[PDB]
Amino acid sequence: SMEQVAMELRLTELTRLLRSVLDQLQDKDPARIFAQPVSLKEVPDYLDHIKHPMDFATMRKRLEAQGYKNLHEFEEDFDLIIDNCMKYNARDTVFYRAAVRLRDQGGVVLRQARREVDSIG
Numbered sequence: 232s233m234e235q236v237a238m239e240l241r242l243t244e245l246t247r248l249l250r251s252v253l254d255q256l257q258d259k260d261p262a263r264i265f266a267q268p269v270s271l272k273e274v275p276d277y278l279d280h281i282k283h284p285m286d287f288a289t290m291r292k293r294l295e296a297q298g299y300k301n302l303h304e305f306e307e308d309f310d311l312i313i314d315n316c317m318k319y320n321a322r323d324t325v326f327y328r329a330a331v332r333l334r335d336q337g338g339v340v341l342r343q344a345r346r347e348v349d350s351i352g
């Protein structure tokens with residue numbers, strides 16, 4: 232139908248916007264701590280602690296499959312990256328501190344993204 236196609240155009244546009252957001256958020260992780268899944272080979276107990284792992288590469292895979300229907304779904308995954316890290320790692324670690332910095336700097340990006348998704352529709 233024409234309606235289906237119009238919807239898919241919207242989804243494609245959202246994906247375009249979220250691709251820009253994702254690039255901006257990942258730039259706030261210059262250490263690349265969150266670039267890839269936590270290695271279950273190197274951290275074999277990880278899933279005993281963290282029930283829903285997340286990382287930027289996994290987000291990008293879902294993104295390019297147009298798997299984020301709205302900004303809320305995308306933000307949920309971003310929050311998983313940060314929250315998983317701040318639970319597994321103690322406050323005095325480079326990992327926890329990188330997550331705090333990513334959270335703080337990312338808030339600015341996400342605040343304007345929400346306005347853009349709302350504005351453009």
Ligand SMILES: CS(=O)(=O)NC[C@@H]1CC(=O)N(C2CCCC2)C1
Pocket residue numbers: 263264265269270274315316319320326
């Ligand atoms: C690229 S990397 O920095 O080598 N690994 C990233 C993960 C993110 C995370 O929370 N990690 C903890 C460190 C203790 C075991 C799991 C390391």
